[PDB]
């Protein structure tokens, strides 16, 4: 009749089983263990049959004495504290029933009778299974309410993990209700880094892996062979917590960083969001992918419905979450692509619509908006961000910078000496986009560099400089008319070449 003393709880941290209290019935279990050896020797002498009634009615009087009163009292008190408290301490409580049960296995070996070493031993283990059966595995109390308090501690310690990232860095629509609800069917925070979430920083995935793989191990080793079903249940609750609450909540955190998608001349809230989604990729995708892979290799016992946890749970979260992040890297690719494309070509009618056919060959808003838009966009994080997408961030975001070179550098619409201003400002961006963090532009913006020396077709430098190597990035009949992308095309008979 204990009154649930402190403390109770001090045990709900992101770790294994924890602080007070004993057990204090392992006191009573040791007392029944040496009392068991005592009446074992005494009734071993003073009886005729052996299991009768020591194993028969005095093990029955043991659990009827102890496990009825003291252990259902312990369920009343441990459950009277909380649920996940008595879930983990039910794993420890019944694990202690397996401890003292194994002490009745070695203490059973202190006995020396074969039918007692038959299921009369497992009658004591069967009354241990009766103490199991008061909170039986056959109900959803021992597993599904253990999964329910495991969802309490799961959404508690995991959903509120990355606290200001989960709730909130957005409304949160955050392109998950906007882009994935449209395409697969903008300032949101500012401005440092992947700073809990992503992921967070793999430590929340070590927290959710810690407690969730902890109690997953606890109900795993604790419960009977009906385990792979609940392994798909709670593993699918990790598909809730990680493939949905950290691919689409704590990476909707990262998609609140990709709420700076469509970031045309808005590359400051995507100057801290390259590392945020890049570390969702690195920590969340790398850590959750290899950790869920090798952890899932242990978790699959022998079933072929376990392959439905391989393909449809895990690998379809790699293809589905691949559709999450890479399409948000397609619309984040539209954020950097609209950034350098719209913002870097946004020079006025003296640079990007220049008629300066014999002067103004220098740097301008092509250099300032190329180095500012791109080199403030991707040379802020994405130069040092994703190596988890190394050739994808560098070679593909820089390959879209080469696409942005086709929108800003090879699409700088300036005249016969303004093309030379593209040969000092967009060729002044060709090396600079190759240092802007999206840095694959040393060959196709360098094609826009020779095209920039081709886009300066005046009446003395129009034929063979436009007929250079990468000056065929100017048009096939628009080599001499390479400044037909300008106000004035090519200064008195642009089109005397194709015939």
């Amino acid at each position: 009749f204990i009154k649930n003393v402190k403390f109770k709880e001090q045990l709900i941290d992101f770790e294994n089983h924890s602080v007070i209290i004993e057990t204090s019935m392992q006191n009573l279990i040791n007392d029944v263990e040496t009392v068991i050896k005592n009446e074992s020797k005494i009734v071993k002498r003073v009886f005729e049959e052996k299991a009768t009634h020591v194993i028969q009615l005095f093990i029955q009087r043991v659990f009827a004495q102890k496990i009825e009163p003291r252990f259902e009292v312990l369920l009343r008190n441990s459950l009277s504290i909380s649920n996940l408290a008595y879930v983990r301490i039910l794993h420890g409580l019944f694990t202690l029933f397996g401890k003292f049960t194994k002490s009745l296995i070695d203490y059973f070996q202190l006995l020396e009778i074969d039918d007692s070493n038959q299921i009369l031993s497992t009658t004591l283990e069967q009354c241990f299974a009766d103490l199991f059966s008061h909170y039986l595995y056959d109900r959803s109390k021992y597993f599904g309410i253990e999964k329910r308090s495991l969802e309490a501690i799961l959404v508690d310690m995991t959903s509120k993990f990355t606290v200001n990232y989960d709730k909130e860095i957005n409304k949160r629509v955050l392109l998950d209700k906007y882009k994935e609800k449209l395409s697969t069917n903008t300032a949101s925070d500012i401005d440092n880094s992947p700073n809990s979430p992503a992921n967070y920083s793999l430590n929340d995935v070590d927290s959710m892996l810690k407690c969730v793989v902890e109690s997953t191990a606890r109900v795993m080793e604790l419960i009977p062979n009906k385990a792979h079903l609940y392994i798909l249940e709670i593993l699918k609750i990790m598909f809730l917590g990680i493939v949905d609450s950290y691919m689409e909540i704590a990476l909707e955190v990262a998609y609140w960083k990709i709420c700076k998608v469509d970031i045309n001349k808005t590359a400051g809230v995507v100057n801290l969001n390259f590392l945020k989604f890049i570390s969702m990729s690195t920590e969340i995708l790398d850590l959750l992918s290899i950790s869920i892979k090798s952890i899932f290799l242990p978790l699959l016992n022998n079933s072929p419905e376990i392959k439905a946890q391989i393909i449809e749970m895990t690998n379809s979260q790699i293809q589905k979450m691949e559709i999450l992040i890479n399409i948000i890297l397609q619309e984040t690719i539209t954020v950097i692509s609209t950034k350098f494309s719209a913002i870097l070509c946004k020079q006025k009618k003296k640079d990007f619509v220049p008629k300066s056919q014999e002067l103004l060959d220098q740097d301008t808003l092509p250099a300032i908006e190329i180095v500012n838009i791109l080199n403030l966009i991707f040379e802020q994080s994405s130069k040092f961000l994703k190596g988890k997408n190394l050739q994808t961030f560098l070679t593909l975001i820089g390959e879209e910078l080469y696409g942005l070179l086709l929108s800003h550098y090879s699409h700088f619409q300036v005249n016969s000496i303004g093309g030379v201003v593209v040969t000092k400002d967009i060729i002044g961006y060709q090396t600079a986009i190759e240092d802007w963090g999206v840095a694959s532009l040393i060959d196709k913006f360098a094609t826009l560099r020779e095209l920039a020396n081709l886009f300066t077709v005046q009446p003395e430098l129009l034929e063979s400089l436009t007929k250079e190597g990468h000056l065929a990035d100017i048009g096939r009949d628009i080599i001499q008319s390479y400044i037909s992308n300008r106000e004035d095309f090519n200064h008195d008979n642009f089109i005397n070449s194709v015939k």
Partner: protein, 50 residues
Amino acid sequence: NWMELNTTTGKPLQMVQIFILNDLVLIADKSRDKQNDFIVSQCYPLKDVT
């Protein structure tokens, strides 16, 4: 009398009599098959038993 172990988790499995015959193996869970008539025959031939 090999009380078997759950090989993955390292916990115990059910018990099994080990019946090593001349050229075939009967790793049989005789529980609660107290015979030894039709016990649970984890069986194969010895010529490719590893």
